[PDB]
Every structure is written in C-alpha cells, then in structure tokens.
Amino acid sequence: DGVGNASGDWHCDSTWSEGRVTTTSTRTWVLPTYNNHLYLRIGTTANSNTYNGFSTPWGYFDFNRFHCHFSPRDWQRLINNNWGLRPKSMRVKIFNIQVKEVTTSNGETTVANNLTSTVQIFADSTYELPYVMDAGQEGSFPPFPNDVFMVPQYGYCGVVTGKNQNQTDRNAFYCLEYFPSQMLRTGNNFEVSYQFEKVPFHSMYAHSQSLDRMMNPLLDQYLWHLQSTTTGNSLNQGTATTTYGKITTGDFAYYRKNWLPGACIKQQKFSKNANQNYKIPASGGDALLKYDTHTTLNGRWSNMAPGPPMATAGAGDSDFSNSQLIFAGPNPSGNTTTSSNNLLFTSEEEIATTNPRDTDMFGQIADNNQNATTAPHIANLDAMGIVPGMVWQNRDIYYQGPIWAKVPHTDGHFHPSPLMGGFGLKHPPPQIFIKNTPVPANPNTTFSAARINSFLTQYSTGQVAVQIDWEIQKEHSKRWNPEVQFTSNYGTQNSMLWAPDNAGNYHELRAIGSRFLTHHL
Amino acid sequence: DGVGNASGDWHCDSTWSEGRVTTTSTRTWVLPTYNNHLYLRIGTTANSNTYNGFSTPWGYFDFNRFHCHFSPRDWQRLINNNWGLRPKSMRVKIFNIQVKEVTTSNGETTVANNLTSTVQIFADSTYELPYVMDAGQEGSFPPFPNDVFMVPQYGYCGVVTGKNQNQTDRNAFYCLEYFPSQMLRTGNNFEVSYQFEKVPFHSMYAHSQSLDRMMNPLLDQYLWHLQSTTTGNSLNQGTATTTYGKITTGDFAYYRKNWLPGACIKQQKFSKNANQNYKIPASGGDALLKYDTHTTLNGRWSNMAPGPPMATAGAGDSDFSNSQLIFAGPNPSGNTTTSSNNLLFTSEEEIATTNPRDTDMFGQIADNNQNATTAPHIANLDAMGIVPGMVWQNRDIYYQGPIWAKVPHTDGHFHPSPLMGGFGLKHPPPQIFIKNTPVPANPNTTFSAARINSFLTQYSTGQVAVQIDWEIQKEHSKRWNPEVQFTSNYGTQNSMLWAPDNAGNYHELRAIGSRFLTHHL
Amino acid sequence: GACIKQQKFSKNANQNYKIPASGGDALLKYDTHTTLNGRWSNMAPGPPMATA
Amino acid sequence: SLDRMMNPLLDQYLWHLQSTTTGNSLNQGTATTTYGKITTGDFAYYRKNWLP
Amino acid sequence: ADNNQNATTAPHIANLDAMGIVPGMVWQNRDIYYQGPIWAKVPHTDGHFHPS
Amino acid sequence: ADNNQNATTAPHIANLDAMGIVPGMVWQNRDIYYQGPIWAKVPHTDGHFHPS
Amino acid sequence: WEIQKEHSKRWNPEVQFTSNYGTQNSMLWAPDNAGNYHELRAIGSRFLTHHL
Amino acid sequence: GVVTGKNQNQTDRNAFYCLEYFPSQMLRTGNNFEVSYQFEKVPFHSMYAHSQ
C-alpha cells in the first residue's frame, strides 16, 4: 500500500487446544549488503577440512530452532503434559520493510529513508537450491522476542574431490537472480504457506521398563539351557559334565528374549577433570580428531558426532563423549573455555533402557569354538550394526535444539531420523531468501560496457512472523504414582533464570530435554 | 490512510443530560525510548523498602485521575447538583502519530520525520499483566488540556521474600513482545472500548444527622436501665443501692440503639506547628516509620496510610494524621518543604457522623468484672474490627484523586472499596501499552549472531482521546433551607485561581472534595 | 462470633461496687461505650452475645 | 506482594510528613516539620488501597 | 498468646475482650420479643455489615 | 500508635496481636491438601462471614 | 469436578509438583515390601502462580 | 521396572500400577464374561523350507 501504512502487526502467542498447539513468533531483523553485491567462490585446501563453494549476496531466514517458537513456560506445558509432538502447518510473513540510505560526509555517518528502494524475496518451494538450514548453525531467531537479529548470509558447498579444493566438472554454481523474486518497497509485504508431510511423533517420554526385564518376574520360562560344562566353581577344573536346567525365575540374564538392543558404535570417553585425561593435542598427527571415532568419506575424516543414538553419561557426570551435544552459557569469552561449568551438557541417559551405552560396547561375542583342548574366548563388540529384532529409541529434542532436518536426496536411507534430533523431512520448510536490490551510485556521463562497481550504501530492516501448527498427543497413562516434571528448582537467586539480567541480557543457563513423563515398553 | 491525512480530531467536552454526563479529553503526548530498548531487572535490598522487579522498554497511558476528565467548572456542576456518581462506559483513541529521527552531527541535534517507522500499541483486556495503574502515582494526563505530557515508563514488582531482594522460583517475568500488538505508521490509528461493571454510586453528600441521634428527641424509650449502684455523687461512697429508671427524653447517650459506628484503627496525630511535636527522626531505629501505625507483611513494615475510613481533622486544623491524603501546590521546590502552607490537606471530617475519629479511638471497654471489693476499670479500644451492626461511610473522592482501583485477585476480600478513594473494580479499565519499534543503525557487512545493540535515536508524539460515560443521581431532597455549595470565594486576586498565571503555568491551589450537599440518615 | 465485653452488674445491691449516676466517675464512664465525634454512647445492647 | 502492587519506576503524587526533627536521633535536634513528596524507592511509605 | 515462648521465656496469655469478625465466624442474632420492636431502618450509608 | 505524642509526650506503639476485619482488607484462604477434607457444612445460623 | 485451566502469560517456568525423591530402596506412593501403602508426604494444591 | 545399574533401588522413573484402578466386571456364579479381538494385518509365517 503506502509509505504511511503499516503492512503487518506484531503477533507472538501460543494457543493451546485439544491435541493442538499453535505458536507465533515475531522478530525484528536487519539485512546488510553481503559481499558488496557479489558472488564469491570460496574454498581452502586443508586436509580433512578442505571445502569449496560460493558465498552469495543473499540472505535467508532461519527459524529452525525450538526456542524460536516457544517460551520456557510453553516448553514446560508441552513436555510435562504430552507424550508426543510433531509439526503440521506453517505460515511466514515478512512486512514493515524499511530501506535505509547511509551517507558519510565529514567522517560521521547519517541514515535516511530511501522510499523507492526495493528488497527481493523468494521462497524456494521446489528445493532447487542447496539446503543449508538444517546444518545446526547460527542465524536462527533469538529466543527472546525483544532482541533484533541480523539476517545470516547464504552460501553453499560442493563436491570435494579428495583433500584438494579444486573443482571438477561435477561442481555446480547457483545464481539466485535466476529465480523469480517478488520485489518490495516499504508498502509491500510477503507471505508464504507450507504443509508438513506426515511424520511420526517425537517421543517425549522415557521408558519405565528395561528392554531385558519385559518378563513376568514371578514365573519360570518353559525353555531350558546349558548351565555348565563342569562341576565346581573354577574354570578348567572339576569333572566334565553337561548340566542342563529349566530357566527359573530369578535369573533373568538367562531368559530367552524376543528383542535385542539397538545398534552401537563406540565413542571415546573424556573426563571433565583435566587430570584424568591422557594428554591429546588439538593438532598434529596425534590430533584429537584422530582418536575420536570418525568416518572416512572420500579419504577425509569426519567426527562421528553425535552419531547413532546411544545411551550416554548423565549431564552432571564427570565423563562425556561426542554423542552428547554441548551448548554454551554466556560466561565464555572468545569461543574458547577451559572450564566445563560454562557449558550445557546434554544427556541421552533416558534411553539406557533400550539402547547400548555410547562409551561401553554393544556386548561381547564368542569368537572361537571351544573344546576339551581349547578354552573359550570372547571379544568386545564395539560397533554392531542393525540385525533383525533390534529396537531402539531416538535422541531427544532440546529447547535449544534443531526442529527438523532435510532427508538427503538419495535412493537408499535407513530410519531417516536426524542424528542431532528432530523431524526428518523429505520436503522440509522452504528457505526464504532476501537481498537488498543494488542501487547504483552517480555514474559516468560517457558510456562504458564495464559493469557497475559503484553503489549507494544501504541496508534494510523489517518484521518477520512465523506461525507453526503443532500436533500433540496427551498422556493417558494409568501410572498410580507421580511423574517426574520439569520444574523451576533453582532456589533463591540474585537474578532470576529465564529472565533478563541487571544489564538487560537474556541468557539460557540450562539445557531442557523433552523427556520427563514415562511410558512402559 | 496517508501521510498527509489526519487520523483523528481534537475533542474536549462535557455533555450533560438527565442522569448522565459524558466527558471527553484530548491530550498531546510524547513517547521516548525507554531503557535503550531493553528489559532491565531492578531491585534493592533495603529492609522494609526491599523490592524487585523489571523495567520494560514500554510505556502506558494513565487517565486514572479525576481532574483528567473534568474542568473545575464541570466538577462544580457535578458535586453541587448530584448525590451520586459512577462510571459506565469508556472509549480510548490514539491517533495522529509522528515518529521522529534525531541526528547529532557537529554537536547540535536536528529532528526529522521518519515516515516508515512504527509504534506498537495493545490494550491488555484480559489482565494478564501486573496492573500498576491504580497505585496513586504520577503519569496521569495533565489537568490542563493545553499541556503536553511524557508517557510514563512501565514496570512492575514481584514477591519480596523477607527483607532480601533475591528472587525465588515464584517470581514471574513478563515480556510484552509476547503479546499481539497493532503496529502503526503515521497514517494508522488505534481505538478500544470498555464497559464498567455495575458498581455502587459514590456518595457525594455528607450526613445531616448523627448516628447516635437517629431517635425522636421528644419521646422516651420504653426500655429501662441501671442508673447507679449507689446514692450520692461520689465513687466508692454512699449507700449501695441498685437504682433503675426508665430511659427518659433528654439523656440520649443512654438510649438503646440498633446500630454502631464503623471500624477504627488509631493513627498517630501530628501538629502543623513544629514546637508542638515530639522530636522524631526520619531514619534510624527511632524513625517515624516506627511510630506511625503500620502493618507487617512478611516481616516488612508498611505505613497504614490512609487505612480504613475514619473521621479526621479539618483541613484547616493544626493536627493531622496519615489518614489524610496530602497534595502539593506549586510552591515547593525539590520534593521537600518545611511549611504546610505549600500543601493541600484533605479532610474526612464529614464522616464524623457515622465514623470514629482517626486519632482518638472507637470507644472504651470495661475490661474487668467489678464487685463490692473490685473497682471498675476501663481500657481504650484503639483498634476495633467490624462487628455485626456497624455502619460506616467511605472516604471521599477528590478532584485531584484517583478514579478507580483494581480489586486484588484473591478469594477473600471485604467491602472492596479502595482506601485512597474511588471505585473498586474486579475488571478495571485496561492498561494500554505503547513503545517505539526499534530501528537498527548501520550494521556490519559480515554476519554476527550477537544481538543488535545499535539503534537510530527516535521518539514519537501523537494525540490521545479518552471518553467516559458517567451515571449521576440528582438530589431530590426535601430540605427547606439552603445547602452548602462549592463556590469561588477566593476574593480579590492578583492572579485568578484555576487559570494560567502571568508566566503561563497552570496550578491547582486547592483540594476539592465531592461532599457539599447533605442527606439524612 | 464477635465479642465486645460488657460490664457485669448484680441485682443484689451489696455485691456491686459503689458507682454514682453522675460526676466524673458516673456509670456512663464505666460501661462499655463508643465515642462518636467526642461523645460517649452506651453500647447497649451492642453486638449479639450470650448473656445471663 | 500486597504491598508491592505499585510501579517501581514512578513517584506518587502524594506527600507525607518525613520527620519532626533534624538529625538521626530521637528527642534531639531542632523541631521542624519536614514534608516530602513520596519518591520512588521508599515503598513502605506509599499510600495504598488495600490492607492485609 | 501474646509473646513467643522459648527456653528462657515463659509463655504469656492475655484476654481478648473485644474481637471483631474474622473469616470463619458464625453467630446468632438477638431474639425478637413480644414487647420488642418489629423492624428498624437500615441507615443510609455506603458501608454496612450484617444489617440486622 | 496508642497515644498522642506532643512536645512533652514521647510516642508509644503497641502490638496488634489480634485484629479483626476492617474495610479494605483482602486475604487468601488456607490451601487444600491431598490428605485433607473436601468440604464442610456451613453451620445453620443466621449470621456467618466468609463461609470458607 | 469443574476445573479452570491456567492461561497465564508468564515467560519463565513455573514450580511444578514432581517426584524428586531420588534413589529409594522402596518407591514412595507405592506398596512396600510387606504390602503396606503409606503416604509419606503432604501435598498442597499451590504450585502455579498468579499475579495480584 | 527400570533397573538402574546393578542395584535394585528404584528411581523416580519407576511406575506402580494398581489394577483396582481399572473398571472391572464383577461376576457371581450366574454371570459370564466375553471379549473379542481383531489381529492387525501381519505377514504370513513361512511354513516351507527353501529348495534352492
């Protein structure tokens, strides 16, 4: 419409109904000019870290993280009362757009409105561009609604061939100006809608049974087993006798079972105490990248973090592995710290019921055939892939964690649940790209065929609103005794948690999982 | 609509009809940026003065005071002609909104219009936020229609636990961006309507009878009483005789009565003459807070001011108590004065008919059982709560006084009439919040996930209009002789009262109650 | 329920202390009374209470 | 809290007697009636609509 | 009980001679008499409590 | 404050141990407990106050 | 039973009634070794908060 | 229920189940009980051995 009419309103809510919750988030954004209106190819040849790609002039909106859409109170209502969650529909608006001229004259900068400038926006619905939004990276909305955020710069990668960055004929370039975009002046606004595909509910419960205890404790099995090959308590001694017995109540380690625990790949275990670790450098041939479990893709090492879902240490335990996601509090300065008290540790220990431990093993296998002259021998199974009859539990979603990931486009995949948590989606929520339209500066009055390198310095601000419809399963359980609940236990504090501080800073001092309520196997 | 079209008009009126008066007030406001767009938690640990809470970036409109809605002539028409008053409906408009850029270059500031900036507005109709508007505080509209006022900054408190400010798990934080707001550019306007719940009329009359004189002076009672236990005029002397008599006309202190005066809690009495007071310091262990009647809430002292409704001294009397509200004239400088001539004293003395005096007592009680060997003894009743059969009169409303208060949300309450005067309301007129939308400054051209700390300096101005429908009860009394009226008695003046002065200042030099007309019990 | 104590008198003259009808010691003083604008009023009957 | 229901950022327009004397001590100093506006930060002195 | 007792402080009690109404009280009105008044006019006032 | 101070009379305060309800009070009821009673019968009486 | 759901706009998390009991030889709120059912805590109803 | 480590002690995640907390039919000698069920679609078991 006009320059003096607002093209949208501020909406932040959570609306709760039966089997349904709708969240709406509104933020203020600022968009700079990226790469001085240029596409730049980027890439470094650095062993395993070798990459190549392009940084675009464009930018994109990332809401992918849960604390974007929920207050800490709403996250509490969700995880205390409900067994399951999943997204249903989505709507995004971009409005109240303001383009700013910035001028420097005497050495000090002034800002004015440019009323005739445009900003370009398009959503990629058909996924024709590389999808970077699921990578677990910064640029998501700030969790606190009053904070203003910079729109992140868009860029992508391409095939790395070996450890060298040089491109081959299979590398692709993508110009985003080669897409239809809407162009918006201050009166214009943008809107797009999306439908989530049907996906299994996330499990917001922990199991109240163990996979190996699923039996009736009062009863014997009708199955029989070999109890011993000899009399007495000692190995390689006594009389050789095959002793069979009915499998009685009270020895439940010997019970025949229908199901097996899930897959495992062992992780290296580290201590939060510096004195209990061996001394492993960050770089060199002995670098810690070497001694963590890694995968090799085309000759390059990649840390297997988090990896397949596995039980891990408690968040307050001394030991930890790469199977645990780590978040930071405010206290660190400069992206490095020597103290674990400044970090937020994630624990999967809830799934220790159905899942093998991350740092222990799947089990121990008998690797020979014993006989009268051959003693039995066992080896550890450190990594055991999936076998018929296994059941397992996924990693938990976190309030600081990602909501979804895009299932890679491949003909094979197995159990397409993202390993950092959340909802695997063949077609995920689309990326919405935004750039400032270049405004040339004062040109030469004689013609040149050279491209224009000279531009007015500009940036834009505006409002973005995301609405997500969530489907929730309420807990119907018949458990008699009270559940674990997520509560505020923090006690007496100089400054409230989950609130702004003395100086106006909003920090998240805890990591909150979704698993409080329980369910039986 | 547009930038060149006004979105509202100036309306200031009082419209008088039968049983009805409608007031309309229009003011010009200015809204700054508060806390540099931040939420700040605030709190000091100071014994009884310990508090905690948050100051918001937002602001809110307060019309709660009577001189906002009435001219001194309209207040006169009301209180001379009418026995009763109460609000009925309300409508608020906010319009003609102007956002200003302010720039500093050479050391001197310039102001320009920013046509694309917005201001955010919402009314909290469902009372989900702490209601601060009834607290008897500054930020109400100026009584004089030509004056421009700053919009007050919004903030709230929370539970104080003991005398320490530290928060517990019961303290709540409130983000106002977590509410749906309308966003307004210069062409946009805002409107909201409200209905008052049914409330008893305020009594604009004083009683022309005394609670203890309600009898017929010409007649005896048929009741009998014990006149004396002895002959003669002296205590503990004479012959012991039980003497009974009919209760005759002319002794009206002995008459049996159906009703009792209201409740009392004694106040300390102070003199406006410095030499007639004992010397009581402002601070220390002997501080005046100690020797005023106070209440203890969770260990903290609070002055009981005004307290329950009680008769008090005349506004021109030497003595005064905390039961009297005090207003200031212009003369004081620096929020302190040693002279009472600069203040406006409020008097409740009209209610001395039905109410016990604030500084005297409810009465005197017989605290023993006398007998031949035991002399009778009496004690003062300083504080007597309500007993069946009491009747009382509320504190009066003042032209400088608050119109309403929000009845606290609690399961018990008794006679929910605000103690500073006015209309107790379960659902009061809503708070209407307003803030300037942050406009980021020139950002960095490389991405950072840090929040934006850099902002264009802005403020907004505009117009606000409040319309209240009032219901009034006209006086029908059969009194033969003339009433007391509120009049201009001021005599010959160098400068008119209730008018601007030589230099253009508008001051209120008197405090005007509502009680002039009389009514019989 | 609520209470405000009353002075108790005997119908037997010898069991009462000697209280005159008038004066500064007058019986109006030693009965429970209320003060309204400085005046004493006997609190008779007063709030409902069990009695003899 | 019932006694904190106010806005912590704002003063009342009400005035009160702060002290009857100069100095920090009882029964000492010069006898002076000192009045002041009731400022933000002393919330024990605020006039209130409700009682516990 | 008007104090707080402790190992060094003996407990002390005072009489409640006049106690106003508190939440949870129940009471009975005075009786009507054959020689007594039938009605009274409730005073015209904005407050009153249990207008019997 | 149980007296009236003056130049020759120091101020004096007493404790209010029992204070009945006065106009303008607000209060909160006792909480219900999982081991606690659900209801009570309001006594049959002509007066009662806040029958919780 | 009729229940009112909490609609509050509080940003930060509430206090909740939870099982905090930790590691136990015998579960609380469950029968014991010998078949006895005991209640080892007293549970009020007040966890959630509301502003005045 | 969940075994935590090699120790039997329960944690807060252990659940108790009272079966009297379910609706039951009660039967005297003349009464009888009946219930029906539908299997979900499942692959046939293979009752053959492979000849290749």
Numbering used by the authors:
A (entry chain B), B (entry chain A): 222 to 742
C (entry chain G): 483 to 534
D (entry chain I): 431 to 482
E (entry chain G), F (entry chain I): 587 to 638
G (entry chain I): 691 to 742
H (entry chain J): 379 to 430
Copy text from the publication:
Adeno-associated viruses (AAV) are single-stranded DNA packaging viruses of the Parvoviridae and belong to the genus Dependoparvovirus. The virions of the AAVs are composed of non-enveloped capsids with T = 1 icosahedral symmetry and diameters of ≈260 Å. They are assembled from 60 viral proteins (VPs): VP1 (≈82 kDa), VP2 (≈73 kDa), and VP3 (≈61 kDa) in an approximate 1:1:10 ratio. In this study, the structures of the AAV7, AAV11, AAV12, and AAV13 capsids were determined by cryo-EM in an effort to complete the panel of available structures for the defined AAV serotypes.
In addition, both AAV serotypes possess a single aa insertion in VR-IV and display a different conformation to the other AAV serotypes with the apex of the loop positioned over part of VR-V. This subloop of VR-V and the alternative conformation of VR-IV are responsible for the broader appearance of the 3-fold protrusions of the AAV11 and AAV12 capsids. For AAV12, HSPG and sialic acids were excluded as a receptor, and no binding to the available glycans on an array was shown. An interesting difference between AAV4, AAV11, and AAV12 for AAV vector production is the requirement for the assembly activating protein (AAP) for capsid assembly. While AAV12 is dependent on the presence of AAP, AAV4 and AAV11 are not. While the VP structures of empty and full capsids were largely identical, some alternative side-chain orientations, e.g., histidine 230 (AAV7 numbering), were observed. In the AAV serotype structures determined in this study, the histidine side chain preferred the “left” orientation in full capsids.
